[PDB]
Amino acid sequence: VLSEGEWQLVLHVWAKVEADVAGHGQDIHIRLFKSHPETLEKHDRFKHLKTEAEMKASEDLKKHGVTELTALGAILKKKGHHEAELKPLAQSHATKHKIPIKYLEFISEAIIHVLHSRHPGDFGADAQGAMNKALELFRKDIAAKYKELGYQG
Ligand code: HEM
Numbered sequence: 001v002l003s004e005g006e007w008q009l010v011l012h013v014w015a016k017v018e019a020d021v022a023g024h025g026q027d028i029h030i031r032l033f034k035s036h037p038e039t040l041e042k043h044d045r046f047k048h049l050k051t052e053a054e055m056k057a058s059e060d061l062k063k064h065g066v067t068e069l070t071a072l073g074a075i076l077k078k079k080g081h082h083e084a085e086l087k088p089l090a091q092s093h094a095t096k097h098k099i100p101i102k103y104l105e106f107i108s109e110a111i112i113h114v115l116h117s118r119h120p121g122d123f124g125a126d127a128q129g130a131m132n133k134a135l136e137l138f139r140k141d142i143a144a145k146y147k148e149l150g151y152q153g
């Protein structure tokens with residue numbers, strides 16, 4: 001569970017993300033794919049992109065990233081009260097896309113990495129910890145939803 005202060009730190013840095021959702025989404029996926037190439041295999045249409053510049057030039061990948069970060073942003077703003085916005089997310093990622101919880105940890109690392117790289121003055125130790133707790137909570141609750149749907153994350 002997060003304090004109100006921690007949620008404010010999360011939402012404050014998220015406001016910085018919202019200044020360039022597309023750009024953040026691209027950097028997060030670039031970071032993710034380079035750190036964990038196996039995650040690229042879950043994308044039938046992005047497995048062809050070879051370089052960083054090609055990934056940045058992909059409108060498909062850019063739209064995909066906005067979709068994910070938008071959904072995450074909406075979840076974060078619920079400050080933990082996100083069961084309703086988590087069920088559809090869990091359902092598509094467990095039954096359709098088959099995304100292991102381990103992969104959600106990977107993109108979480110990428111998120112924290114990109115947020116630090118872009119906003120060092122707004123993402124200090126306290127802000128990083130709060131975001132980590134927020135993302136942990138997200139993964140925790142979605143893992144439970146996974147199980148309810150009969151998928152071992
Ligand atoms: C931060 C957590 C994540 C959020 C919030 C998120 C959110 C979404 C949303 C909102 C969609 C569109 C609707 C849907 O299919 O559910 C989507 C599609 C997808 N996501 Fe995620 N996602 C997350 C992590 C991941 C991870 C880690 C992977 C795998 C590496 C992944 C792979 C996919 C794929 C493969 C699709 C559908 C691609 C398509 O539209 O053709 N997602 N995600």
Ligand SMILES: [Co+2]
Nearest residue numbers: 029064065068
């Ligand atoms: Co993605």
